[PDB]
């Protein structure tokens, strides 16, 4: 009586149940694991807070309306302030982590709409100015708020044009990245497990984000007659196999 459909994920002191899942994706078919010695470089023993950092943090909720263009969060940024995960983050020189991402959106059998939930490794954004204008730090570190693709261009911020993925590629091809759809008629959640993907064994958690999670409405939300025209979307994310190394004074970052 197991269905692909019902699932339970327990991680730390927190549990999620979905009764309307559509399997789960594990990026590149690899599950998060700690850093092996053969791959290690820094000689420091690392710190593995385990259950105090590897639990589920639910970010603040978004509201899908007929005019929504899509939202974008960066990792580990989105979690920069969650509990002890965040403290560890500002206090060590280097850290490394994988995540379980669970995006939630329920409706009824009269609604229609379909969101794309995708994880993009190394999502370098484009400046809407063109040329070689850079995208300032603050703009690519929105924190739990994430970036709202239907917000206005700002100065020093990225471009927010959806048919171009914020980088000069077409929305249609985002499907080459680990992703899952939430089609109100099928699905009510999306779950993706992200292994740590980098060109170095461990890195800085503040100067470099290693994935952007993106939720994009593709088939517009259509509510039943005289229904309220909107649904909330909630994102809950859990660091998994986290390791921190090179402890010290506590980083100070712009803004």
């Amino acid at each position: 009586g197991y269905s692909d459909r019902v699932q339970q994920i327990t991680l730390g002191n927190s549990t999620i149940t979905t009764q309307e899942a559509a399997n789960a994706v594990v990026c590149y078919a690899e599950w998060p694991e700690y850093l092996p010695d053969v791959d290690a470089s820094d000689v420091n023993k690392t710190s593995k807070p385990d259950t105090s950092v590897c639990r589920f943090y639910t970010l603040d909720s978004k509201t899908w309306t007929t005019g929504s263009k899509g939202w974008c969060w960066k990792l580990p940024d989105a979690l920069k302030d969650m509990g002890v995960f965040g403290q560890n983050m500002f206090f060590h020189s280097l850290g490394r982590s994988g995540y379980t991402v669970h995006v939630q959106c329920n409706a009824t059998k009269f609604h229609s709409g379909c969101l794309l939930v995708v994880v993009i490794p190394e999502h370098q954004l484009a400046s809407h100015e063109g040329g070689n204008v850079s995208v300032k730090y603050t703009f690519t570190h929105p924190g739990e708020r994430g970036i709202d693709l239907s917000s206005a261009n700002e100065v020093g911020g990225p471009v927010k044009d959806v048919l171009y993925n914020m980088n000069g590629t077409l929305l249609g091809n985002l499907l080459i990245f680990p992703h899952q759809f939430i089609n109100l008629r099928t699905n009510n959640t999306a779950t993706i497990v992200i292994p740590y993907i980098n060109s170095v064994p461990i890195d800085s958690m503040t100067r470099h984000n290693n994935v952007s999670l993106m939720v994009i409405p593709i088939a517009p939300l259509t509510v039943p007659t005289g229904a309220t025209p909107s649904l909330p979307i909630t994102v809950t994310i859990a660091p998994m196999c986290t390791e921190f190394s090179g402890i010290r004074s506590k980083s100070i970052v712009p803004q």
Partner: protein, 273 residues
Amino acid sequence: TVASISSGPKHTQKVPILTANETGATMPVLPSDSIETRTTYMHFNGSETDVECFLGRAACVHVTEIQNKDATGIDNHREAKLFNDWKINLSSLVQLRKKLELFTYVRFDSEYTILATASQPDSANYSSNLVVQAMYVPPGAPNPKEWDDYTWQSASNPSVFFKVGDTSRFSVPYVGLASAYNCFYDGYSHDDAETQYGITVLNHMGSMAFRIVNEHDEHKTLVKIRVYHRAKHVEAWIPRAPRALPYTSIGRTNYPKNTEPVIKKRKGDIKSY
């Protein structure tokens, strides 16, 4: 190898063509799941689509130019093209760039070919024979100030001398600092409020300096350098969506404003053929 097996009528409870794309999978459906097929063999291996093959041919990565002329009274050799210099990079020209950016991280050895041809746009009695000297000036090492500085001694820095009209060829191991080169980097060099974003900060490869060894003749001679790059021993990770809009800058993803629609509009209906 069979490309298609033989398959006949079906009346089952087992439907391989109905799936749920919401899952993120592309189910491996074949012609024989939905029509009646006959056996056929592949006769093919997919040899020429190997990434080593795809990135393994020489591509032009840079065209520069230097001239041989009397430096007498020149206050700025660099500025007179008495010796140009190139900030090594692999995204200045776009044919090869779009190919590499199909991947996120890439690792390979490089084979460089350098072709140098001379031009004599204004009245010369003859064509002189010039020897070019291209130096590798990695970051931290004195960079040439005049076309005949102590720098050119290049006692510790690899340099090649070849003749204009000829070609020079040598191969450099993968010089990246990390395990792969980042084709993309969503980071900064530090948490500064105004530091540049992108890979410009990561792809710190240093520059390469060219000059003519010959002193000047009576006429002036323009030498134009073309650098070709071939990846050998390629390794590529994490495929990405291909580049759709035009490029504007080395190292940023930025596209131009008021660009044009990249998807061709139908001449007719959705229903049109």
